[PDB]
From Swiss-Prot:
Organism annotation: Salmonella typhimurium (strain LT2 / SGSC1412 / ATCC 700720)
Gene, per the UniProt record: sopD
Phenotypic consequence of gene deletion: Deletion of this gene impairs bacterial replication in mouse macrophages but not in human epithelial cells.
Family matches, as InterPro entries: SopD (IPR022747)
Name of the protein in question: Secreted effector protein SopD
Effect noted on mutating F15A: Localizes almost exclusively to the cytosol of transfected cells
Amino acid sequence: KAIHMGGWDKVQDHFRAEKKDHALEVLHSIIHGEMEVNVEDINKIYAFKRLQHLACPAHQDLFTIKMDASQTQFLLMVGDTVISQSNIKDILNISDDAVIESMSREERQLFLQICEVIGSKMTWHPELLQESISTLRKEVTGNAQIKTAVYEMMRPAEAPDHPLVEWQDSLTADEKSMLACINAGNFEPTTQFCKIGYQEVQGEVAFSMMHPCISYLLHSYSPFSEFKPTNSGFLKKLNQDYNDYHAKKMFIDVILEKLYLTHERSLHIGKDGCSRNILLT
């Protein structure tokens, strides 16, 4: 897809095809009204990918990212050498005394994948956010392999493309109350389930909630430095729902199971054709 930054459309004509990626990396370092932005940590993730991609194909396994024992620092590793690190609160642009819930190994790899994509849009397509956050985000949330990765982890048997099932309300007033917490104390059938995943495993359906860092980074993240505390507010909220859901999981799952079984084994529930119960679109 065409890169345009730094007049690249015509500037690229000065370079041999085999040098264009090198010249872009350089052009990127020359060029990168305007609100101040905090993206040095988050861009490391995609930059590390760019590094790895230049190494001999058999050395590529040697480039990896892990966490320190506290899982609050990502460590960029070239074999055993830690070439650089990033605090997760700096990657997230969050206000520091902000609570981050821990992620499984699966969830972390997904978080990092979203980091790559975001980093790559902000690096090669700065025009995107120059418009608005929503224009950046559309490109991230609309992105094929991110879509594919989010569905594969949370709803492995549902295609991202899955057509909505029509809402049929079999919930008692108590059940709708019990559900309020997975969507900020509201009960709206078209949105209540946007954070829930599910998979069938040896005859049982197992529900989950989207990790609040992953939902934050998909739908609430602002790279702008100046609203650090606003980002933090959004995160605490997703934290709270996440924690409520786990405190009450054995009541909530009974009800999810009922809904899933009565909506064609999906929680991608809509009304009059209008769902926002997708994980992301």
